[PDB]
């Protein structure tokens, strides 16, 4: 994730009710009882009616585009090969072929039909996570569900997808002792772990 | 072409926020550190100060230095920047509010320049590490070794891969304004800026004015010293008070995108291969903790994983068809162990 | 009111003692560090230099700087103080011989100002830590969390809660005195101070004088260059030679009393409560090592304790009557687990 | 007598090599660090910069500073040297290419001065530790304790105990030479130095000349900008290109020999001896990890070893004839345990 906090509201004398904006995991909680020191000491002249509305939503990191795990539901598909035959006196063909037992590949001069192979062990499991080059046959929980801290706390369909699922357990707390800031209490990602408490 | 991101430069100002342990304690530093990102691999962190260094107020020289002093900027030279952590970091580049710097690991992050009269630093908590990409768990990038696809931030500015919202500032306090008109509390204005004013007593209730007086109240400590000065937008820090009026425009890029650089990267010393009957003894002796692992290529995989930092003679029951062997990010080996028992 | 502790100021001088690893090795620094106290919680250490910074020699400005150079003081500006440890500390306040400074943990303590021509520092061993008060074992105070009763030293000086004995100095060496009277070794005096003198040979045997000569001996290296200069008392450092005459007066306060401040303090992230049949599964995920513990409220207590820093799903066989649960210094929870097995 | 090692001074130059993580990345710093030696005990490391600080180019003042800027030296003041590691080190002394500095432990080593316009540092990986000699495993030398035979480097220069080969430099690149003669690429010379020249095209093929032109090629990027400038030898760094001609002379000493200094050294707090029947209970409480060990003086030795850092009440079945006891480098004790069971 990146808790890209929108800048909180500070009403000086009285309440500012928050609304549940549609941002992913839009955590927002009104707070009173502040006295926000901002560059001149405090600035709101009340002392309890000083209101502070903190809001924070979850958003894809900039690394999400590039450094990102990637789940998959994996079926069986169809296997391939760049079969060389330095045939007979032909002495050469290096052709890409299939396995399904009626496909020819007339590259060179020979027509060749391969498979289907009997050894249907797809080393990929049904559910797979993928990361850069290291591929993990992991039972990823699902889109839309991943427990915060666990893998897939952020779950975006793709990189472009503005919608997502962010169970991060993002819980705002009130800022301390009349100062402007935004306590965001949050699990570091299940993408942070899964990079150093992962599987092989 | 340092003149291609006047999106930020002209239109954004050096924001000032509340640093958490600003030398003594919580000050309000212009270089207040938000969004520490020790998430790459190359010894690098991308940081945002609330201060917008780069060009000056107007038009010149990335390598100058504009923070906020007063309500005002101070667009001057960068002379003695210091990012640091457990050790002093190395700057990489600055653009906008944002700096990239090569740091070691550190429990915290600790930033600061030197204006010249004062140290005037800012410091923050953030868990930092630098694993290099590879099965070697170094603490630091070497001079040599294989290159392989790390995650890392750029040197450059000509960058659009993302953009963060940067709309207006809210007001700010400035009780330097609220002087006294020899019996009454006297507000003034920066340059005709919009000062939002009233006191606990009943007097002028909005304040959109030049320098006003205050008929009713007298004490400076019961009045609204405010600066609606939204001629330049800001970063939308959590340590910003909202500009209550509107979501003004000011969508503004990020320079330091995470990119797929191939870091100059790790390599673990070669193994000592030793033969036995369908068995690899391997006296082994790394530089750093190295994740070794294998794959007995039977349909029985029987793999193994163990980080090795302490030199260790290990063993591997190799089968008839083969095994493979991965001494860190050194490439994977392979081995025929047919018979040797005659 | 910086003018309420002329007990120390007028009457105490900046003492000079033997620093143990004074940059190179054992020098005699005026800022020789004794009584390091990393015994509070708030990132703070109270230190005593043998140097008495604060007001000047006479009457003004706590923020000036009087150490001993020569037999003499040098009551000038504090410009570039540096306390430090594993990292550079943060000064909190100075009063008298004594400084309070916010430090991180460190195996040692390492102090030093900059006179301007020279670094002139002093360093020492002392085991330092900062546990915050709470069942969270942080390494550093956060910005937020609950407040609770820590132990900590004050900012202030108007302080009498304790006082340490501060009687006279003993003599000190000063062989700058023992010049040569063109064949004889020649002692002088600071200002009419009391110079205690004789040589290995037989000549003047006490020395309570103005500038004397030496009839008998010749070599500077066999004579008593002493300064009984007890116009200003000192701290009773272990690195002081006794003033053999008497226990003179000079009972003198300590500024930095340990007080019952409520530190801005720790807080561990909330737990994930999960139900089972008379059993709390708790997937748990802290920031720092957190001492969790419980009390099965039967007359069978059956408590549990474990510091948790690694995130861990735990379990608790809750009974019929109840259990309580203490996620760090977060307040204690309580739970009805009657049946759930239908 | 700073004038006894003109072996190096007159005849060696400040070499420049390729620093590995020179702030940003691999630069070519004159202070390029080779041969880090964290092999002594006294908190000290002997380092070689490729830069030869010490006297100037000609004859004066060890405490000045000559590195290479350009093809040229810059023999000026040392003002703001910084060796550092995990923490900032303390300089001990420099002589020639070589500096001794008191450092703490550190995963790396990180060196750098300040010319004045620029930081201009150099950094390197090297595993550093400082065990003091003794059965106490401190992290740092104390002020007190017993003295015992450590290994350590000298302060001094009047040193011949070893000498390293220091023959010539090879050539170096300098494309500042290869200017343009308004259509042709134009080489020049430093002072009549020997410039080794040709381009990918066919033109002058050796180059032992004053300022030549280039008839054939035009592009600066396809020519041999070389400086055979072997008027002053160098250190034989691995980051040197060979001077292909010959093994010239220039055998040159090392200042900082490892010597058998008795470090001011460790000492562990005394034990609490407690009697039992042929048994030593010992409540024990060290400062640091202390290797305790014993020798039951029977021909049955039955010794024991255990590093103790955590305070521990231990036990020792003492026999009739005796046992001995070694609380760290505190001297060995001995004990009669005859009967006590009456």
Task: Outline the structure in words.
The PDB classes it as virus/immune system. The entry lists the keywords cryo-EM, single particle, intra-virion crosslink. Cryo-EM structure of SINV/EEEV in complex with Fab fragment of a potently neutralizing human antibody IgG-106. This is part of a larger assembly, with 1 copy of chain A (200 residues) and 3 copies of chain B (342 residues). Chain A has strands at residues 9-11, 27-32, 51-56, 69-73, 127-131, 134-136, 154-156, 164-166, 171-172, 184-185. Helix content of chain A is 0%, strand content 19%. In chain A, strands 1-3-2 form a 3-stranded antiparallel β-sheet, with no helix packed on it. Chain A has a 3-stranded antiparallel β-sheet with strand order 4-5-6, with no helix packed on it. In chain A, strands 7-8 form a two-stranded antiparallel ribbon. With 200 residues, chain A is mainly beta. Chain A has no helices and 10 strands. Chain A is rod-shaped and about 95 Å long. With 342 residues, chain B is mainly beta. Helices cover 1% and strands 31% of the residues of chain B. Chain B has a 4-stranded antiparallel β-sheet, with no helix packed on it. Chain B starts with 5 loop residues before the first helix and ends in a 7-residue tail after the last strand. Classes of the chains: A mainly beta (200), B mainly beta (342). At the A-B interface, strand 1 and strand 3 of A face strand 16 of B.
């Amino acid at each position: 994730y990146k808790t890209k906090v929108p800048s909180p509201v500070v009403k000086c004398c009285g309440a500012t009710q928050c609304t549940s904006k549609p941002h992913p995991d839009y955590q927002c909680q009104v707070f009173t009882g502040v006295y926000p020191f901002m560059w001149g000491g405090a600035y709101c002249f009340c002392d309890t009616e000083n209101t502070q509305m903190s809001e924070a939503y979850v958003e894809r990191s900039e690394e999400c585009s590039i450094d990102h795990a990637k789940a998959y539901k994996v079926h069986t598909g169809t296997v391939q090969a760049m079969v060389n035959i330095t045939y007979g006196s032909v002495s050469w063909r290096s052709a890409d072929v299939y396995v399904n037992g009626e496909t020819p590949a007339k590259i060179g001069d020979a027509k060749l039909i391969i498979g289907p192979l009997s050894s249907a062990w797809s080393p990929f499991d049904n559910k797979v996570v993928v990361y850069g080059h290291e591929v993990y046959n992991y039972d990823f929980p699902e889109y839309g569900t991943g427990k915060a801290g666990s893998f897939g706390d952020l779950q975006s369909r793709t990189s472009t997808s503005n919608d997502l699922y962010a169970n991060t357990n993002l819980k705002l707390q009130r800022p301390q002792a009349g100062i402007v800031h935004t306590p965001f209490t949050q699990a570091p990602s299940g993408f942070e772990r899964w990079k150093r408490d992962k599987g092989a | 072409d340092l003149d291609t991101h006047f999106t930020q430069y002209k239109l954004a100002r050096p924001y000032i926020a509340d640093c958490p342990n600003c030398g003594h304690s919580r000050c309000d530093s212009p270089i207040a550190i938000e969004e520490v990102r020790g998430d790459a691999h190359a010894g690098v962190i991308r940081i945002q100060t609330s201060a917008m260094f780069g060009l000056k107020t107007d038009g010149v020289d990335l390598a100058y230095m504009s923070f906020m002093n007063g309500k005002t900027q101070k667009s001057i030279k960068i002379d003695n920047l210091h990012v640091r952590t457990s050790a002093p970091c190395s700057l990489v580049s600055h653009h906008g509010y944002y700096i990239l710097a090569q740091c070691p690991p550190g429990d915290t992050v600790t930033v600061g320049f030197h204006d010249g009269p004062n140290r005037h630093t800012c410091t923050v908590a953030h868990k930092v590490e630098f694993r290099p990409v590879g099965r070697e768990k170094y603490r630091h990038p070497p001079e040599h070794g294989v290159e392989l696809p790390c995650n890392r931030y750029t040197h450059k500015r000509a960058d659009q891969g993302h953009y963060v919202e940067m709309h207006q500032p809210g007001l700010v306090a400035d009780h330097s304004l609220l002087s006294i008109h020899s019996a009454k509390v006297k507000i003034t204005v920066p340059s005709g800026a919009q000062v939002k004013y009233y006191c606990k007593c009943p007097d002028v209730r909005e304040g959109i004015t030049s320098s006003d007086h205050t008929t009713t109240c007298t004490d400076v400590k019961q009045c609204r010293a405010y600066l609606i000065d939204n001629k330049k937008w800001v970063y939308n820090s959590g340590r910003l008070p909202r500009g209550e009026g509107d979501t003004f425009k000011g969508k503004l890029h990020v320079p330091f995108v995470p990119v797929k650089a191939k870091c100059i990267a790790t390599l673990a010393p070669e193994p000592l291969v030793e033969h036995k009957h369908r068995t690899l003894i391997l006296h082994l002796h790394p530089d750093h903790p190295t994740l070794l692992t294998t794959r007995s290529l039977g349909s029985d995989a029987n793999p193994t994983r163990q980080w090795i930092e302490r030199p260790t003679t290990v063993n591997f029951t190799v089968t008839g068809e083969g095994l493979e062997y991965t001494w860190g990010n050194h490439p994977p080996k392979r081995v025929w162990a047919q018979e040797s028992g005659e």
